[PDB]
């Protein structure tokens, strides 16, 4: 069902994360980590302290799709190096909420007030997505029955 998902997204903040290649998103899915340029690292650390949940919604450039979404479980911290394909700051730990894809064609009815009401697929890496549009975007994804949000809820 969708009820634990809606609970996780209650009063959350949402950020569009753009990746240049699929390999980086695959690494993030396997290891539960993300890293970003310093301008976005500061924004996400501020958001992590400000909100019950901070959700990163991932899209690989030119793919025409989002590749899933995850919740920050930590602020950034400077561990085992990660063989990203590229200056990058610290490492955020993340819990995946959905590892399934969603095509941009399916989110055409959602506009982001914090980016001039352009379709939510449009935005620079780090663009914040307003609460309502972000919640509806996350609910469009196909359910990921491999994930149990019980442990995610316990970290909030």
Instruction: Extract the annotated binding site.
Output: 18-20, 34-35, 84, 125
Q: How many domains does the chain have?
A: 1
CA separation for the pair 101, 97 (Å, rounded): 12
**Contact, 56 vs 129, CB < 8 A?**
no
**For the sheet containing 13-19, what is the strand order?**
33-34, 92-98, 68-72, 54-60, 13-19, 128-129
**Contact, 91 vs 34, CB < 8 A?**
yes
User: In this structure, what token pair is assigned to residue 114?
Assistant: 């914090």
Percentages helix, strand, coil for the chain (3-state, rounded to 5) are 35, 25, 40
What region, left, alpha or beta, does residue 2 occupy, with left being phi > 0 and alpha being psi -120 to 50 degrees?
Answer: alpha
H or E element, residue 57: strand 54-60
Backbone angles phi, psi at 109, to 5 degrees: -90, 5
CATH code, domain with 45:
3.10.590.10
| Resolution limit, Å | 1.5
Q: Which of 63, 66, 58, 11 is nearest to 35 (CA)?
A: 58
Experimental method: X-ray
Instruction: Extract the annotated binding site for RNA.
Output: 18-20, 34-35, 84, 125
Q: Which of 78, 68, 53, 55 is nearest to 19 (CA)?
A: 68
Q: Which of 100, 97, 101 is nearest to 150 (CA)?
A: 97
Domain carrying residue 77: 1-156
């Amino acid at each position: 069902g969708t009820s634990k998902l809606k609970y996780v997204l209650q009063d959350a903040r949402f950020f569009l994360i753009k990746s240049n290649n699929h390999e980086n998103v695959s690494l993030a899915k396997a290891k539960g980590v993300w890293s970003t340029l310093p301008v976005n690292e500061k924004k996400l650390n501020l958001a992590f302290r400000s909100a019950r949940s901070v959700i990163l919604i991932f899209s690989v450039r030119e793919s025409g799709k989002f590749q899933g979404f995850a919740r920050l479980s930590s602020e950034s911290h400077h561990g085992s190096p990660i063989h990203w394909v590229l200056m990058l700051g610290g490492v955020f730990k993340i819990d995946w909420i959905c590892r399934r894809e969603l095509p941009f064609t399916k989110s055409a009815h959602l506009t982001n007030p914090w980016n001039e009401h352009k379709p939510v697929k449009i935005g620079r890496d780090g663009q914040e997505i307003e609460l309502e549009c972000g919640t509806q975007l996350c609910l469009l994804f196909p359910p990921d029955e491999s994930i149990d949000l019980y442990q995610v809820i316990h970290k909030m």
